[PDB]
Design a protein around this ligand. Structure first.
Ligand SMILES: *[C@@H]1O[C@H](CO)[C@@H](O[C@@H]2O[C@H](CO)[C@@H](O[C@H]3O[C@H](CO)[C@@H](O)[C@H](O[C@H]4O[C@H](CO)[C@@H](O)[C@H](O)[C@@H]4O)[C@@H]3O)[C@H](O)[C@H]2NC(C)=O)[C@H](O)[C@H]1NC(C)=O
Ligand SMILES: *[C@@H]1O[C@H](CO)[C@@H](O[C@@H]2O[C@H](CO)[C@@H](O[C@@H]3O[C@H](CO)[C@@H](O)[C@H](O)[C@@H]3O)[C@H](O)[C@H]2NC(C)=O)[C@H](O)[C@H]1NC(C)=O
Ligand SMILES: *[C@@H]1O[C@H](CO)[C@@H](O[C@@H]2O[C@H](CO)[C@@H](O)[C@H](O)[C@H]2NC(C)=O)[C@H](O)[C@H]1NC(C)=O
Ligand SMILES: COC1=C(OC)Cc2c(ncnc2N2CCC(CNS(N)(=O)=O)CC2)C1
Ligand SMILES: *[C@@H]1O[C@H](CO)[C@@H](O)[C@H](O)[C@H]1NC(C)=O
Ligand SMILES: [Ca+2]
Ligand SMILES: [Zn+2]
Length: 817
């Protein structure tokens, strides 16, 4: 008589009513809405609904007969039978999977929350119980590094291909390809054009090895790629309620085994939507985080109902983070260029510039003009123009023709457009910035049989996830930019054991040859003590050699993986090196700076000693470089460094230890070796160094072939010389600063791929002290050891006692400060 329970929509005698007319009259029973209406609009049971008379319009049932008819709401057992929800159960380990027939290989589900910045879980974890329990019981990293630009289509497509955007071709939501003379838009028919989507998404990889796939939304899953769609896919429709997407994937997981997928995707637009609309710190984002947390709960609760919660491997992930934009932190190019109508500028933090007249002027247009026009125009300028090949190599953002030849690097929180007309609300949340900025860092949680429990893994890159998902599905990965085995530490039972790459030809020898003590045109500083008997000073005892190797190559010698290549090892007291007869230059030197080693200020300009182990060549003489305006030289192993005296190490002045070096770059090189290397040595109680030249004329992140390099020599004073595109440096100390680099239990690395440029316009040297800008340029141009390996054709640390997987982990690390 007081309640609608069991009498929805029926006439009553006893006071309160349960028909739609009651609301106007305000004579409804107090539980009319909860009992009779809400069930049409909600996917949950509650205390009002437990044992409800079945309603025909209800989205799911909480009626006693719901289990028989198999349409109980997912939380039925939790709420109406008093059982515990997935989130309410304590963690318990999944050593053996408990899977049905068909899942002898257990399924993997890639669940994306768009624009879930890593920080959201750091800060609001107390409000996110489900994602928090997955972290607790699973494999988590505080930060998963996205690809540049930190945008949705690029990162989603990267996750499922293991490719950098420059390689997979989806470099933004809006693109122009000049070869195609077509434009890419998400609003357009070209969105569906397979020409745009390169590489191999995992759903294709899986199909070729006989696994079916179900994608409830993912970029590319609605495109015929290598002639294939996912076995089940959905046309993107953001209006589909989240509950309906999760319920559909749970339907797919009950398909008969012959047609049931192994690889699944789930995607939600939150918290990216709220993040843009109201900012990353906002009531709206908190509410969205709680919503997606609940949807993750609905999935886990559903998997429990299906006895699949100790079967399915879940990867909960995000494309990128989110940052607070400001109208006071937006740069307009028209301030510097005027209201010109010949250029189209892509707005935001990953801003790019292209001529209007395309494809005609795309290559011919004067990029360098605008580049210099916009450089160092203000002090503490919040943007920097870059020809795409001069962007830090760590960003891997240049190979694709779809990348405009002039790009901008924006500071944290800063964005750029041509003018205020061509951009949306500047006060909005945004992303797209440098993929090492904290607020761009992304979510990763792995949970399931395949993944470890209660592990917090060090930061890794989303490009490594493709190989990981391949391992979880026992697939052979297509070729990608992940280092296979670098994430073996995340897996209970790694399926791929990596091996160090095998050197193609063993080292040729460079034996001493009796030759004249020839004139090099050098006016040596008198202090320097020349090499009085070369054959004496460089005929070393096997006892003497063991000591040198142990001090200079404590991790083994860099191995060379290039096919057509001839290198020779050169021995010295303070350093070892690999010399290329082919390019008249070392590919690498290795030396070790100890805590209390001495760095000399004594000048050593215009001083070289001939090396009788290689033929003398014109480019090895001080004469070639004397008042040469076009190129100078520099030393890999530093002459400044003496272990024996406080003077200058003469052996470092050999012709074999010099590389072509622009005068401008000497400022950087001299500051590094004089100042920084000393500080690094003191700070870390010794540091092993390996440095060398880099030739990437294709700007493709890879060492150029010898064949290619022959056509890229410059002719200077009627000599053929090869000038490095970059110089690499790899510092190595111990995690424990008590031990020196020769006896590390654990390696701490720091590597650089410094661009080799004829001016230092990059750094805006004007009215600034020298110290500041060099350190900043090194930090911007840091790189993974793996980045160095790719671009030099070298392979480091091959003689370490550590297993290979642990080395790959170390090699793929990028330091962040
Ligand atoms: C990230 O991973 C990617 C995959 O491992 C790497 O990209 C691959 O780079 C190679 C080197 O260019 C490229 O392979 C090809 O080599 C030929 C050049 O010698 C190229 O022409 C070949 O392709 C083809 O030739 C015809 C006519 O030109 C083409 O129409 C056809 O495509 C035919 O197969 C050959 O494929 C790959 O193209 C490329 N893959 C992708 C998807 O980009 C990156 O090197 C790597 N990046 C880093 C920094 O590690
Ligand atoms: C994109 O997804 C949205 C949300 O799922 C779709 O809109 C919804 O469409 C349904 C039916 O497709 C509508 O429901 C009702 O359908 C019955 C059909 O018999 C009809 O009697 C009702 O009057 C009502 O129309 C619903 O109104 C609609 N919106 C909401 C709020 O759920 C949409 O169809 C999808 N497709 C595209 C491409 O937009
Ligand atoms: C490249 O694409 C541009 C833009 O689509 C082409 O310009 C079009 O030319 C056609 C006929 O050739 C005209 O009917 C259109 O009105 C033009 N569109 C626009 C917006 O200008 C251009 O001709 C294409 N081909 C090449 C290789 O330049
Ligand atoms: C099925 O594959 C597709 C998708 O898989 C997810 C997404 C998508 C597609 N086409 C156009 N736009 C798309 N979206 C990406 C970005 C996405 C954030 N917008 S938000 N967070 O404001 O609501 C909203 C638009 C196709
Ligand atoms: C840069 O060129 C523009 C034309 O786009 C011109 O308005 C401006 O004066 C130039 N700025 C300079 C010379 O730095
Ligand atoms: Ca190259
Ligand atoms: Zn977004």
């Amino acid at each position: 008589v007081k309640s609608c329970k069991g009498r929805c929509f029926e006439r009553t005698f006893g006071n309160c009513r349960c028909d739609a007319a009651c609301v106007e009259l305000g004579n409804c029973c107090l539980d009319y809405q909860e009992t009779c209406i809400e069930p049409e609009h909600i996917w949950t049971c509650n205390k009002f609904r437990c044992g409800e008379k079945r309603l025909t319009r209800s989205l799911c049932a909480c009626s006693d007969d719901c289990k028989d008819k198999g349409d109980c709401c997912i939380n039925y057992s939790s709420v109406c039978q008093g059982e515990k929800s997935w989130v309410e159960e304590p963690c318990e380990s999944i050593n053996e999977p408990q899977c049905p027939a068909g899942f002898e290989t257990p399924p993997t589900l890639l669940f994306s929350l768009d624009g879930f910045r890593a920080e959201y879980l750091h800060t609001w974890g107390g409000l996110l119980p489900v994602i928090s329990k997955l972290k607790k019981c699973g494999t988590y990293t505080k930060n998963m590094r996205p690809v540049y630009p930190t945008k949705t289509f690029p990162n989603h497509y990267s996750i499922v291909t293991g490719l950098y955007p420059e390689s997979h071709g989806i470099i933004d939501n809006k693109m122009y390809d000049p070869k195609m003379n077509a434009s890419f838009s998400l609003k357009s028919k070209e969105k569906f054009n397979p020409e745009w989507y390169k590489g191999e998404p995992i759903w294709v990889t899986a199909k070729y090895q006989g696994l079916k796939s179900g994608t409830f939304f993912w970029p590319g899953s609605d495109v015929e790629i290598n002639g294939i769609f996912p076995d089940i896919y959905k046309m993107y429709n953001g209006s589909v309620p989240f509950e309906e997407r999760i319920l559909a994937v749970l339907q797919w997981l009950q398909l008969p085994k012959d047609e049931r997928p192994h690889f699944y995707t789930l995607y939600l637009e939150e918290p990216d939507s709220s993040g843009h609309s109201y900012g990353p710190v906002s009531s709206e984002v908190i509410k969205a985080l709680q919503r997606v947390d609940g949807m993750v709960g609905m999935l886990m609760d559903g998997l429990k109902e299906l006895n699949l919660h100790r079967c399915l491997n879940l990867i909960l992930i995000s494309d990128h983070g989110m940052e607070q934009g400001s109208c006071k932190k937006y740069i307009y190019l028209n301030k510097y260029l005027g209201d010109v109508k010949n250029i189209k500028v892509i707005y935001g933090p990953a801003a790019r510039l292209r001529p209007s007249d395309v494809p005609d002027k795309y290559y011919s247009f004067n990029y360098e003009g605008i580049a210099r026009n916009l450089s160092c125009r203000e002090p503490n300028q919040h943007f920097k123009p870059y020809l795409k090949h001069f962007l830090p190599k760590r960003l891997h953002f240049a190979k694709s023709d779809r990348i405009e030849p002039l790009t901008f690097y924006l500071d944290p929180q800063w964005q750029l457009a041509l003018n205020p007309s061509e951009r949306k609300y500047c006060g909005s949340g945004f992303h797209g910035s440098d993929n090492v900025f904290s607020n761009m860092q992304a979510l990763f949680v792995g949970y399931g049989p395949g993944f470890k429990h209660g592990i917090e893994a060090d930061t890794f890159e989303n490009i490594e996830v493709y190989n990981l998902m391949c391992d979880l599905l026992n697939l052979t990965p297509a070729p990608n930019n992940g280092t296979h085995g670098s994430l073996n530490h995340l897996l209970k039972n790694p399926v791929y054991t990596p091996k160090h790459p095998k050197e193609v030809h063993p080292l040729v020898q460079c034996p001493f040859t009796r030759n004249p003590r020839d004139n090099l045109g050098c006016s040596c500083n008198p202090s320097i003590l020349p090499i009085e008997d070369f054959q004496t000073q460089f005929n070393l005892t096997v006892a003497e050699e063991k000591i040198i190797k142990h001090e200079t190559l404590p991790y083994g010698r860099p191995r060379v993986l290039q096919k057509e290549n001839t290198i020779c090892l050169l021995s010295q007291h303070q350093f070892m090196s690999g010399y290329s007869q082919d390019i008249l230059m070392p590919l690498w030197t290795s030396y070790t700076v100890d805590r209390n080693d001495s760095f000399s200020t004594e000048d050593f300009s215009n001083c070289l000693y001939q090396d009788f182990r290689i033929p003398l060549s014109p480019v090895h003489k001080c004469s070639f470089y004397k008042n040469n305006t076009k190129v100078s030289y520099g030393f890999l192993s530093p002459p400044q460094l003496n272990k024996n005296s406080s003077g200058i190490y003469s052996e470092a002045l050999l012709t074999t230890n010099i590389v072509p070096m622009y005068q401008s770059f000497q400022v950087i090189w001299r500051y590094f070796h004089d100042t920084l290397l000393r500080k690094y040595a003191e700070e870390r109680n010794g540091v092993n160094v390996v440095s060398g030249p880099v030739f990437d004329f294709d700007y493709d992140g890879r060492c150029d072939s010898l064949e290619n390099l022959r056509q890229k020599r410059r002719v200077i004073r009627n000599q053929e010389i090869l000038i490095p595109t970059h110089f690499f440096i790899v510092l190595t100390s111990c995690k424990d600063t008590s031990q020196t680099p020769l006896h590390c239990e654990n390696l701490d690395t720091l590597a650089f791929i410094l661009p080799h440029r004829t001016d230092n316009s990059e750094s805006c040297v004007h009215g600034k002290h020298d110290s500041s800008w060099v350190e900043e340029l090194l930090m911007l141009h840091r790189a993974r050891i793996t980045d160095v390996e790719h671009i030099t054709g070298l392979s480091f640390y091959q003689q370490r006692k550590e297993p290979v997987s642990d080395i790959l982990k170390l090699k793929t690390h990028l330091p962040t400060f």
